[PDB]
Amino acid sequence: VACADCHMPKVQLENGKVYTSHSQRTPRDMMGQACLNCHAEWTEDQALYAIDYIKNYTHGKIVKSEYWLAKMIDL
Amino acid sequence: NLKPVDAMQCFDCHTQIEDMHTVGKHATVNCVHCHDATEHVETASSRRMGERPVTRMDLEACATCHTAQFNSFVEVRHESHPRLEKATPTSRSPMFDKLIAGHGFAFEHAEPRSHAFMLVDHFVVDRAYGGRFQFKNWQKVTDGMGAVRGAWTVLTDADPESSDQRRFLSQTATAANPVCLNCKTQDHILDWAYMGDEHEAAKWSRTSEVVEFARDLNHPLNCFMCHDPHSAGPRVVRDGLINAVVDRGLGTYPHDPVKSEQQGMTKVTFQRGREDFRAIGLLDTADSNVMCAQCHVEYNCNPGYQLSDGSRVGMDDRRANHFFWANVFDYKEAAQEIDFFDFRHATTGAALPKLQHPEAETFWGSVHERNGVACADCHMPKVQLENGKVYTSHSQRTPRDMMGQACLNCHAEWTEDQALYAIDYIKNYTHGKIVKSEYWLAKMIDLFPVAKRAGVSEDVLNQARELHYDAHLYWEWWTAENSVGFHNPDQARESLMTSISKSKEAVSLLNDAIDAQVAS
Amino acid sequence: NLKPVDAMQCFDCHTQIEDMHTVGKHATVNCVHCHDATEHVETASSRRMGERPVTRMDLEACATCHTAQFNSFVEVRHESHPRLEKATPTSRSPMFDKLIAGHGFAFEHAEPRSHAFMLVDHFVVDRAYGGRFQFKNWQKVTDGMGAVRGAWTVLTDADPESSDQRRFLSQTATAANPVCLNCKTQDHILDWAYMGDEHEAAKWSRTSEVVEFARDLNHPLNCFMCHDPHSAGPRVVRDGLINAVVDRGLGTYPHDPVKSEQQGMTKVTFQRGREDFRAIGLLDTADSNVMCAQCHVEYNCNPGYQLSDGSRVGMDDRRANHFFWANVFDYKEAAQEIDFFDFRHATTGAALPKLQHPEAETFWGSVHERNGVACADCHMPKVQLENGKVYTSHSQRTPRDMMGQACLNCHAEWTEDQALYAIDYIKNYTHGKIVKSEYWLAKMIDLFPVAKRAGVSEDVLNQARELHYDAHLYWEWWTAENSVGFHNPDQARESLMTSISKSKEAVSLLNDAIDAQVAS
Amino acid sequence: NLKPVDAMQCFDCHTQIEDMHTVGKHATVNCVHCHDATEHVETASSRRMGERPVTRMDLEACATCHTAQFNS
């Protein structure tokens, strides 16, 4: 998998010539084309939930890392 | 990957193309994008073609550099209900079968749908080819992109071994002929002489076997129908339109000599063996009124009969490919000027005209046309983008889908709901008068057998038949025309009241004549 | 609170039940859930019933352990418009009154609505009981749960003191008879002998007073119509269906001997006094095609006449409870094989068939049926849950409400809009041909009085009456059938073109005969 | 309106560009779409630039034939 698969996917058209979207943005805007095409077992809400589980966990460890850095700095 | 050819070499023999190509916005577009001419160049002389070069007529030849326009054109409007018969109580002409009896449209006449389907729909309608052609299955009816790639990628022929027009199912007709195809495709643009006249250099003509012609045709509404592929400038290619505007000197706007001069057409003729063969009409401006009038007009594209003596007018006659280029109140005079009618009514025996989608001729003289508004302003507007390169939408559809760009930009005083209400006021009023016109036509038609059987004279029946011509014309124009009055509401109102008047006159004539027979 | 009984004691006398109950998925479900048999056990012998045990037929007897299926079944689809007459310009058969004149359906024939209402709707329709039964007020029409609890909780009888069929309002009919109820309820399953034949052990039969029978019936579409309550296995209970498939050896799929063998039915007969009394059909597989064919078929459930001599065929005759089990092109032969027709047309005098909702017979041979798809795949699919125990929806409704589960799961190439467009292409085309078939039938019907009055011979009128039978059959099948062609579009197209052909033949015959009379 | 230039003349001095341009999917795209080299061609040799040709770096130089990609 590469950056483009999630951030600049092929456009899906009922009737049209396919081209590659150059709107290089979060897959949240185009989950059908940038996620769910590969993850048939998921709805959009489930895929978003999986993203948020990772971001919430990671952000919590960022905040804790900053708490300990700040404690050290202040010493 | 394409390899460019040396255009200078082509230009040595193709001066008309040189003069168009080197000046316009396709000056940098190499011939190889649309022609394979290697063996042609090896074998041609300055006056003889030699090996025929290949010319691409597929729309993908333009989509490579103009994807936005191609994609907007091919989009399917799913809200444009498909295969919806007009002769039903919930559509445009509830009493169509009684009124049109005698004509091939009785077999099927559906509402239009998106442009991608025009060639396939022409091939599969029940009135056209006796049911010979079908979609490969009922699923393929959705496939607009497939239809654009080619009709024969999505259709089947019930009998590839024969080429005659015949019925394959009982309730079908064989109304199609080669003239029809000129408003569905221009794949045959290099194979058809101007007007479909016989010509040594033409593979196809008005008298060809239409089933064989059909098999050679693939793409709907080629992009080059409105845009010259060499100069990229605005044009028309439809022979019948050029013939009306230029040959017959009627002008692009017959009711406005000044606008006709400002927004005019220049006929350009190409030869084969130094004999005129085909023509295009270059437009002074990018005037969608005249571009769309290549097809959205009343026309003849069929055999018929002479008003003078009733004799048959066949496909071989020039009149079988004809643009009347006349509004509803000038139409009777235009049909008399070519001595022509379409069919005899099955019940009344009246000589009658058959009217078809006269949007261009109806739009003339309307408030919008008089103020310089054109079809594209309401039906293919510029796209509005917060951040983007603007292009012209090619979706060609009702303004209901894009009211911001198609109406509200000019009508700042209105919300979308107000603008829709104004449209519906006109369509509701016009439709009410269409229904009333049909009620009176039907009442008149039903009196004909009663009058014949009561012994009413042929003189009185013929009087009623002359009234039928007018009652029919002044009604059918409006079931044929697709705006349900919107494009010219005052003219629709005047015409439909004329229809009703004519029918009422005929009802009174026949009722009195029947009563007099009975009393005697 | 329920107290279990000793089933071993029951099984001593009920070997058939033992063999079914102990083997299936209801082996642990105690008899007390559905039977109160205490006094029965005290008084019965091995061959004599003694006191009759009580058997619960209410759907709540199953809802206690199967709430999801019960709730999905009882849901009211409010988009299924209620009490919507089909003989109107905006519904299925704009010219129904002229075409059906002579038949009781002229009094009222509405579009179907949700299954919860089937028994109440049968009781209150204007054609059934002379207007005797009404909802308690006009508010109760919404109450699907109330109707399921029991018809008589939501309805009133205008005269509880009499039991005769008669008109209570002028424009009503008394078409109901006991056979009708077999497709509305099976509350009478232990009180009705197979086919409704006379039987010492049957309280009710084809010849019963239908008003008295009606008062004994409460619940729509009992859950056990498709599921044996003892084995929980798939079955049918409808006598007419078992008779066609098994007694007459036609098979579950008359056009496919192999599928009939793989997906077959086993008739199981229960006796009273060691004499055959009632029967069920156990299915080899959980085949909703055959489950739904208990009711969604063309049938006789009424008196009629013989084609041979015109004599009356009453409710006492076996033919008054009959599944033709024949597609539209085999139907005429199936009616001839029992020497039967329904009514004489009020205007033309033709012997005519009356067709009713033939969804099962139409579905045979269609692309979906041939590929092993069944009614439930489109009309009662499995539920899709992100996190949940899957069960089968019992909502029984148009796939428009659940396109993801009912179409798009199989048709990955389509969006919901594309799939809807494909449905509408077929329904629009088919409806157009229905309307045209009615136009031609009406034109033929209107010629009958003109021909009679002009002195046209009985020989010619009878010729036209024979054509009327076919013109009618090949049209009415499609206003009766609920998919507007979707279940078999090619067959609908062929049939409706046949209708039009037959009418046109009759119009030409009568018009010529009238003209010849006039000329003489 | 753009007027095409003689790319073969360019290639007499621009072999690296020739080997790239003639093989790929821009082989039919004339140099005038992105370069104004008139005075360059009049004054250059294979060893001396002469007048510096102009090279277009604007995205509109591509948006003309590739509007869908530009707009997205």
Ligand code: HEC
């Ligand atoms: C799908 C499997 C992905 C691939 C492959 C790449 N990225 Fe991604 N990226 C992904 C997600 C789910 C997110 C979070 C987006 C959200 O809305 O929560 C991201 C985030 C980015 C961002 C920040 C986007 C924003 O916040 O608006 C950038 C700049 C980004 N990713 C860049 C990027 C690059 C350069 C990649 C290839 C090396 C790449 N991503 C791969 C999902 C996916």
Ligand code: HEC
């Ligand atoms: C890298 C960050 C990119 C920039 C800047 C531009 N494009 Fe692009 N383009 C990119 C990728 C990853 C792809 C798909 C390649 C693949 O095959 O998977 C593309 C594709 C194109 C195409 C081909 C047709 C298509 O797939 O749409 C064209 C014509 C194209 N890109 C044009 C284009 C233009 C005009 C740009 C400036 C606005 C542009 N690209 C920027 C990556 C990158």
Ligand code: HEC
């Ligand atoms: C003179 C020796 C020629 C050269 C060099 C080229 N063409 Fe030609 N062409 C020539 C003749 C005499 C004709 C018949 C029409 C006429 O003008 O008299 C043609 C025809 C064409 C056509 C039309 C083919 C058709 O199907 O009708 C095309 C598309 C065409 N020629 C293209 C073309 C191209 C692209 C060339 C350079 C590669 C070229 N021709 C060279 C005479 C000569």
Ligand code: HEC
């Ligand atoms: C890329 C190699 C192209 C092919 C193939 C086609 N066209 Fe084109 N077109 C191209 C360019 C670079 C331009 C100029 C863009 C600009 O605005 O400077 C054009 C222009 C047009 C226009 C506008 C002409 C005008 O306003 O005067 C039209 C209507 C047009 N092109 C249509 C068109 C059609 C119908 C094609 C297939 C036959 C087609 N073009 C091919 C690039 C390319």
Ligand code: HEC
């Ligand atoms: C002949 C080649 C045509 C030209 C040029 C134009 N139109 Fe057309 N149009 C044509 C046909 C044969 C059809 C019906 C196609 C079918 O398969 O049924 C149409 C349809 C339309 C519609 C209705 C579209 C819908 O959503 O139902 C509209 C609004 C329309 N046409 C407008 C239109 C305009 C504004 C044109 C000039 C830009 C134009 N058309 C050109 C045939 C042809």
Ligand code: HEC
């Ligand atoms: C241009 C002057 C035309 C000729 C010649 C023919 N048609 Fe046409 N057609 C035309 C337009 C502008 C439209 C859309 C507007 C409308 O009112 O329909 C159409 C539409 C069709 C359709 C679809 C709708 C329908 O009638 O079922 C079919 C099947 C169709 N046209 C067939 C047809 C045949 C068989 C022709 C020769 C007899 C024919 N068309 C000529 C424009 C033009």
Ligand code: HEC
């Ligand atoms: C007539 C019915 C048309 C057909 C068929 C096609 N196009 Fe078109 N095009 C049309 C109009 C009325 C206009 C606008 C002219 C104006 O200046 O108001 C256009 C414009 C173009 C352009 C120019 C850029 C733009 O305005 O978007 C291009 C590049 C163009 N059209 C391309 C195009 C292609 C590729 C077509 C086949 C899919 C096509 N056009 C058909 C009218 C007509």
Ligand code: HEC
């Ligand atoms: C805005 C002032 C308009 C101009 C200029 C043209 N038309 Fe039109 N058209 C207009 C409206 C409001 C309607 C009714 C649409 C609705 O949804 O109620 C129409 C209708 C059509 C149709 C039928 C479209 C459909 O039913 O899907 C066609 C084929 C059509 N118009 C073609 C057309 C042509 C060829 C024009 C220039 C001659 C034209 N229209 C001008 C609004 C406007």
Ligand code: HEC
């Ligand atoms: C609880 C005491 C129950 C009552 C009352 C009814 N049923 Fe039942 N049923 C019950 C169980 C525990 C099971 C087995 C569940 C499992 O999957 O293991 C069932 C099963 C069914 C089935 C499925 C049978 C099969 O797939 O072979 C059906 C169709 C079924 N039950 C229907 C049904 C009906 C119609 C009832 C009322 C007459 C009914 N059940 C009562 C538990 C209970």
Ligand code: HEC
């Ligand atoms: C006889 C007991 C029936 C069986 C078994 C099935 N159906 Fe039925 N259905 C029946 C009636 C009498 C009615 C009309 C009820 C009323 O009060 O009007 C119906 C209705 C339907 C409908 C329409 C529902 C709506 O929303 O309008 C559908 C889609 C339907 N029926 C489908 C269906 C299927 C798929 C069955 C097998 C699982 C089935 N029905 C069984 C009578 C009976």
Ligand code: HEC
């Ligand atoms: C099974 C073979 C049936 C017999 C016997 C009867 N009906 Fe029926 N009915 C049946 C189905 C599958 C449906 C729904 C589909 C449809 O086309 O309606 C119905 C519907 C009704 C309705 C509601 C719709 C309507 O016609 O108004 C009523 C009022 C109704 N049925 C009454 C009725 C009477 C009076 C019957 C005996 C003469 C009768 N039905 C028999 C299935 C079956």
Ligand code: HEC
């Ligand atoms: C025939 C028209 C049916 C009636 C009446 C009822 N059900 Fe049903 N049921 C039906 C089918 C076609 C199926 C699926 C069979 C398959 O395997 O594909 C079912 C399934 C059940 C089950 C099993 C669990 C499940 O799949 O949901 C149960 C427990 C069940 N049905 C119960 C049930 C009840 C309680 C009913 C009255 C409200 C009921 N069914 C009616 C067909 C029919």
Ligand code: HEC
């Ligand atoms: C999917 C391939 C289907 C199968 C298998 C069956 N039917 Fe169907 N049915 C289908 C569609 C698309 C429609 C039209 C629905 C719409 O909203 O347009 C129908 C219609 C019905 C109806 C009428 C439903 C209504 O109008 O509310 C009935 C009563 C019905 N179908 C019954 C039915 C039966 C009994 C089937 C098995 C023999 C059956 N259908 C199969 C799609 C499908």
Ligand code: HEC
């Ligand atoms: C029209 C005159 C063009 C200009 C200016 C540019 N490009 Fe282009 N490009 C053009 C064509 C006709 C094609 C081939 C289309 C086909 O698929 O046959 C291309 C192709 C590309 C591609 C795809 C290349 C590949 O897949 O190998 C890309 C990425 C591309 N073009 C990008 C591009 C950029 C970045 C431009 C501005 C510097 C540009 N193109 C100009 C036509 C034209």
Ligand SMILES: [Ca+2]
């Ligand atoms: Ca005409």
Ligand SMILES: [Ca+2]
């Ligand atoms: Ca019947």
